[PDB]
Amino acid sequence: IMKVANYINGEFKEPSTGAFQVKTSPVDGSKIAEVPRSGREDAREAIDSAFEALKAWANIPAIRRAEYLYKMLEVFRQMKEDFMKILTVEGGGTYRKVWGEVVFTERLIQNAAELARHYQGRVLQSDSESTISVVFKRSKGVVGVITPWNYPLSISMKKIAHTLAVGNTVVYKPASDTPVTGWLIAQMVAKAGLPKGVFNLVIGPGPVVGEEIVTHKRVAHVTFTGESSTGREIAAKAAGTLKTVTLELGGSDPLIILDDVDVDYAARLAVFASLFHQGQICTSAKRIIVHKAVADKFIERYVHYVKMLRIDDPRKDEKVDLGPLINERQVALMKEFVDDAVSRGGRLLIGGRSWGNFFEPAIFVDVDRNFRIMREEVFGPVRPIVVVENDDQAVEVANDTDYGLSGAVLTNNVNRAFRIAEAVESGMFHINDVTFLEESHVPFGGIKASGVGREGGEWSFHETTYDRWVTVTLRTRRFPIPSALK
Amino acid sequence: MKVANYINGEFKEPSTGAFQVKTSPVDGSKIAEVPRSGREDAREAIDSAFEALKAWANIPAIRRAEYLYKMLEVFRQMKEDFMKILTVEGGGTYRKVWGEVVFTERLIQNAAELARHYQGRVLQSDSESTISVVFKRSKGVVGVITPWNYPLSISMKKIAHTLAVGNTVVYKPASDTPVTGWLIAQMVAKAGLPKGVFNLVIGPGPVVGEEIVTHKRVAHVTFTGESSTGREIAAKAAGTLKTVTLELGGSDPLIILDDVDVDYAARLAVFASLFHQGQICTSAKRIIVHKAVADKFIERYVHYVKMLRIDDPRKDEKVDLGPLINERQVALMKEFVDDAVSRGGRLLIGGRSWGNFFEPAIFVDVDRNFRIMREEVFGPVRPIVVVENDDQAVEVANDTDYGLSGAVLTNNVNRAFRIAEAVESGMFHINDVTFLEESHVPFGGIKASGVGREGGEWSFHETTYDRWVTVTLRTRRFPIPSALK
Ligand SMILES: NC(=O)c1ccc[n+]([C@@H]2O[C@H](COP(=O)([O-])OP(=O)(O)OC[C@H]3O[C@@H](n4cnc5c(N)ncnc54)[C@H](OP(=O)(O)O)[C@@H]3O)[C@@H](O)[C@H]2O)c1
Numbered sequence: 001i002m003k004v005a006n007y008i009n010g011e012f013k014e015p016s017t018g019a020f021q022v023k024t025s026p027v028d029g030s031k032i033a034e035v036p037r038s039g040r041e042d043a044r045e046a047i048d049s050a051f052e053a054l055k056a057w058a059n060i061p062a063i064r065r066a067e068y069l070y071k072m073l074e075v076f077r078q079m080k081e082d083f084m085k086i087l088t089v090e091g092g093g094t095y096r097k098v099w100g101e102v103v104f105t106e107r108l109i110q111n112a113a114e115l116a117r118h119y120q121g122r123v124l125q126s127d128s129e130s131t132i133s134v135v136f137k138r139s140k141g142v143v144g145v146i147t148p149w150n151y152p153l154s155i156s157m158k159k160i161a162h163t164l165a166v167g168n169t170v171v172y173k174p175a176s177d178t179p180v181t182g183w184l185i186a187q188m189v190a191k192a193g194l195p196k197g198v199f200n201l202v203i204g205p206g207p208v209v210g211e212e213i214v215t216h217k218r219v220a221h222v223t224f225t226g227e228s229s230t231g232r233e234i235a236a237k238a239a240g241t242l243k244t245v246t247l248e249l250g251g252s253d254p255l256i257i258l259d260d261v262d263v264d265y266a267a268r269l270a271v272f273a274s275l276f277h278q279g280q281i282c283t284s285a286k287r288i289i290v291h292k293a294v295a296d297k298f299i300e301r302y303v304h305y306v307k308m309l310r311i312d313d314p315r316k317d318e319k320v321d322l323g324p325l326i327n328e329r330q331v332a333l334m335k336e337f338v339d340d341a342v343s344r345g346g347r348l349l350i351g352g353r354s355w356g357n358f359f360e361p362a363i364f365v366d367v368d369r370n371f372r373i374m375r376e377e378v379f380g381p382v383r384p385i386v387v388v389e390n391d392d393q394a395v396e397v398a399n400d401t402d403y404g405l406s407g408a409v410l411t412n413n414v415n416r417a418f419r420i421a422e423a424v425e426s427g428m429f430h431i432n433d434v435t436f437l438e439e440s441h442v443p444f445g446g447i448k449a450s451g452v453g454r455e456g457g458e459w460s461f462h463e464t465t466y467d468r469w470v471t472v473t474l475r476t477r478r479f480p481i482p483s484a485l486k
Numbered sequence: 487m488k489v490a491n492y493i494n495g496e497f498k499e500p501s502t503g504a505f506q507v508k509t510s511p512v513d514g515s516k517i518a519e520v521p522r523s524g525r526e527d528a529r530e531a532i533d534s535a536f537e538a539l540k541a542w543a544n545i546p547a548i549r550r551a552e553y554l555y556k557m558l559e560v561f562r563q564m565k566e567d568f569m570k571i572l573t574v575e576g577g578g579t580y581r582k583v584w585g586e587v588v589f590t591e592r593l594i595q596n597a598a599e600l601a602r603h604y605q606g607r608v609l610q611s612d613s614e615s616t617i618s619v620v621f622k623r624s625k626g627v628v629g630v631i632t633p634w635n636y637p638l639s640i641s642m643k644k645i646a647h648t649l650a651v652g653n654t655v656v657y658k659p660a661s662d663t664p665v666t667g668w669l670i671a672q673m674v675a676k677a678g679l680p681k682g683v684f685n686l687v688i689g690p691g692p693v694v695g696e697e698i699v700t701h702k703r704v705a706h707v708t709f710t711g712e713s714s715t716g717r718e719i720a721a722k723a724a725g726t727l728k729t730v731t732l733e734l735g736g737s738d739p740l741i742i743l744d745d746v747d748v749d750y751a752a753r754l755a756v757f758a759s760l761f762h763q764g765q766i767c768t769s770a771k772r773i774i775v776h777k778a779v780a781d782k783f784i785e786r787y788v789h790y791v792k793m794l795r796i797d798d799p800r801k802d803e804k805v806d807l808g809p810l811i812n813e814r815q816v817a818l819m820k821e822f823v824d825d826a827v828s829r830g831g832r833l834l835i836g837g838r839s840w841g842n843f844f845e846p847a848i849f850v851d852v853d854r855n856f857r858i859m860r861e862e863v864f865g866p867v868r869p870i871v872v873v874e875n876d877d878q879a880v881e882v883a884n885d886t887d888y889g890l891s892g893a894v895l896t897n898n899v900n901r902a903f904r905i906a907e908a909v910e911s912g913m914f915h916i917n918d919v920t921f922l923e924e925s926h927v928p929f930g931g932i933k934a935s936g937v938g939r940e941g942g943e944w945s946f947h948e949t950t951y952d953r954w955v956t957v958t959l960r961t962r963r964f965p966i967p968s969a970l971k
């Protein structure tokens with residue numbers, strides 16, 4: 001009953017040119033909706049609207065912004081089943097995946113509302129007599145939000161909800177493969193009645209709409225989640241107007257399994273960590289590293305559970321384990337990974353078939369450091385298992401990557417756990433749990449090629465505000481020039 | 487005098503043997519031969535810092551604090567040498583260089599005091615049986631690239647705090663102040679810091695600085711300098727996803743309302759606008775006065791400016807202003823004066839120059855199109871603008887691309903706070919100079935003035951990252967495969 005459109009300055013509307021594109025389902029190729037193909041002028045209109053809305057939005061008390069976010073939370077709760085539907089048909093997520101994403105998104109919006117009133121500055125001791133010295137927190141201004149296709153709702157809303165809570169306005173450009181999720185977000189914001197211009201949605205190509213956002217002089221900050229190469233390009237262009245950035249650029253997270261574990265549980269945990277959402281998760285367990293003393297048993301058990309994974313149309317029922325990859329380019333890439341591994345002498349334990357956008361888990365052993373699946377982020381269900389002889393070796397292999405997002409170790413030994421945790425070069429680490437653990441109010445982010453900054457709760461607030469030192473001097477002073485005085 | 491790099495615990499010549507002669511801005515006399523290092527010397531320093539990183543970051547903080555307390559001890563014995571070099575090399579007066587040295591002692595001590603106290607967080611987990619904490623970790627090897635105006639205090643704020651928190655350092659001082667940098671390395675060497683923890687490389691920004699900024703093993707660059715340079719650095723830094731701290735100058739407003747002690751305001755304004763010949767990022771560069779006191783203010787201000795004594799800063803302790811750092815700066819100030827005259831500006835006083843010396847040029851009848859209103863004037867040329875009310879004062883104050891500091895002079899609490907809130911700057915001062923600065927406060931700007939904050943724990947935030955770690959104490963069930971069982 002409704003057309004998909006941009007949302008700019010309180011109004012749903014077509015791109016100025018009227019150009020559109022057809023969004024199809026990765027499940028079966030069927031048509032989902034025609035969507036805007038916006039260009040530079042649509043981006044500019046959104047930026048100007050965000051800019052004009054900024055001062056009124058930033059200057060109201062935090063409690064008023066919290067109120068708007070609680071309204072959004074209310075509307076989101078009403079829209080849950082619409083979001084689940086779209087995440088499944090447009091993004092290819094299974095029922096359990098999209099259910100989890102929606103539950104997390106509810107928690108994120110609530111978290112941002114909860115924290116709005118409580119972001120504190122500092123009162124300082126002055127080294128000088130008769131002076132008051134404090135630090136306020138101020139919003140950065142208009143913030144560009146540029147997001148990916150894998151968890152398009154939760155990733156977008158973590159950025160959007162927290163950025164808004166602290167008095168910034170937003171220009172949001174969703175991934176081209178997930179525009180309907182972006183439009184549903186705009187629907188939610190509009191029904192919650194946020195002031196015009198405070199939130200704007202522009203649907204269009206990254207190299208056009210996104211680049212205008214990154215280079216516009218009125219944008220103060222860009223928060224971006226996507227590929228490491230896209231991020232470095234954005235960071236470079238952002239420097240032109242000295243805007244700050246937050247960048248979460250993918251990972252190749254190590255899951256380290258020691259010899260003292262419950263092997264069967266380790267295998268159940270490893271299967272979930274490595275293959276959930278078809279491995280299309282930035283903090284997926286992309287490189288599995290097992291101690292030789294349990295390697296045979298682990299590999300056997302891991303493959304045993306992988307055999308059970310059910311791959312199907314995710315709309316079929318609630319128990320489907322894996323849906324399709326997002327598009328044909330992803331399938332082609334996964335084929336290259338498999339092909340490279342096999343040609344290098346790698347042992348394909350299980351899997352390898354694809355059809356349309358579907359791609360089965362493909363598990364390898366007997367790999368070395370020059371395999372493409374050891375050297376690159378594998379954003380799909382192709383996974384190497386590496387056998388190591390001791391903990392030093394576990395750490396060496398774990399760190400032999402350009403990335404550094406998350407990581408995990410399974411062991412019951414407190415010494416081995418903590419030593420490995422300290423030595424693994426990552427922004428996040430988890431002992432006895434999956435690599436993709438995530439909470440709404442924790443600092444989520446990486447080091448090395450995985451990007452810059454942290455998002456979640458107050459860490460998001462840190463990214464999109466600045467500290468403002470203000471003093472009051474209560475005494476008159478004498479000055480060193482002109483020395484001829486008095 | 488001959489000066490060298492300090493790399494991996496050793497004072498050494500650049501590998502080309504290339505050197506150049508540094509002269510005094512005061513009289514053009516020789517001061518020293520200094521390295522003209524290249525990309526290989528920078529690479530060596532970076533490599534040394536990288537190899538020293540693990541051992542330096544992983545010792546307890548109290549150990550790093552001890553080294554800093556030792557640096558403090560050595561610095562205290564070298565004070566006079568720093569003052570000498572700051573005057574002869576940088577052109578600073580006795581009062582200026584004394585102030586910089588006192589502040590530098592405080593900076594080093596502040597970094598030592600704070601090292602053991604930088605805390606992470608223990609969080610509430612939304613999950614059962616889960617411990618959730620956040621550690622602070624060193625970023626790695628940090629490049630520090632510095633300017634010539636306050637070469638000691640600016641360098642040490644960055645150096646000491648960055649070291650305190652377990653980073654190693656590659657330092658490239660400004661080409662006009664390389665002896666200051668060498669003296670810093672002397673201080674570090676005598677404190678006995680482990681080899682490679684701190685490294686000095688003297689050479690051209692476009693060669694040595696470029697290599698630091700683009701090298702794969704550098705984790706962070708902290709930079710103080712011109713806005714244009716900063717933008718180039720930030721762009722280059724993106725190639726390897728290193729983070730940056732940038733302080734890029736200012737065009738700070740000093741706002742004077744009609745309820746002030748006018749004579750006091752004039753005295754304060756002279757100090758704020760013209761100390762170190764206005765070569766301060768937080769100099770009061772645009773003076774904005776309420777019409778009700780403007781005539782009286784302008785007269786008193788010019789009266790005090792008249793009294794300033796400009797001379798060889800080596801002469802005695804009472805010289806008010808020395809020279810500018812070089813002839814390029816004098817030529818720039820002449821451009822500013824030329825533009826103001828051409829636009830109808832009224833030169834109330836000053837403008838005389840000889841060699842690197844320049845007598846403060848004060849203009850009235852200026853408007854928003856003058857270069858001295860539109861650009862950072864890093865030197866002794868200052869406009870005074872007259873406004874009719876507080877709204878206009880704010881409009882003029884914010885009509886700049888910069889946003890570093892600013893100040894308002896008034897006894898009215900409502901006007902002071904409303905003006906402070908409305909002025910777009912990273913720092914603001916009520917009833918004091920624009921260039922107020924302490925060792926442990928967040929110093930930095932917004933808009934074109936740069937990115938990030940330095941000073942105390944704010945320096946720590948810039949050169950560390952947060953690291954979320956959890957321990958899960960229960961086993962759970964997972965959603966795939968659903969067939970389980
Ligand atoms: N670190 C994390 O927290 C994390 C978690 C989730 C996702 N991811 C990463 O995201 C990757 C996949 O997502 P993706 O394919 O969407 O990554 P992407 O190709 O880098 O694109 C991400 C977003 O940037 C836009 N874009 C492309 N070029 C741009 C440009 N020149 N200027 C501005 N924006 C531009 C894209 O728009 P278009 O769609 O129109 O091209 C999209 O909205 C994963 O491989 C993973 O690396 C990382």
Ligand SMILES: NC(=O)c1ccc[n+]([C@@H]2O[C@H](COP(=O)([O-])OP(=O)(O)OC[C@H]3O[C@@H](n4cnc5c(N)ncnc54)[C@H](OP(=O)(O)O)[C@@H]3O)[C@@H](O)[C@H]2O)c1
Pocket residue numbers: 631632633634635636640658659660661662689690691692693694695696699710711712713715716718719732733734735736766767768862864890935936
């Ligand atoms: N915001 C603040 O805290 C603050 C306070 C003090 C000074 N300043 C600013 O600093 C300006 C004056 O200082 P400045 O003349 O030294 O500015 P600058 O020309 O930008 O140079 C600063 C430093 O950067 C180096 N440099 C030049 N090009 C480089 C490159 N391509 N890559 C890496 N490094 C490079 C310089 O080395 P070389 O000497 O070899 O060129 C110097 O060490 C003032 O105008 C003001 O804007 C700002």
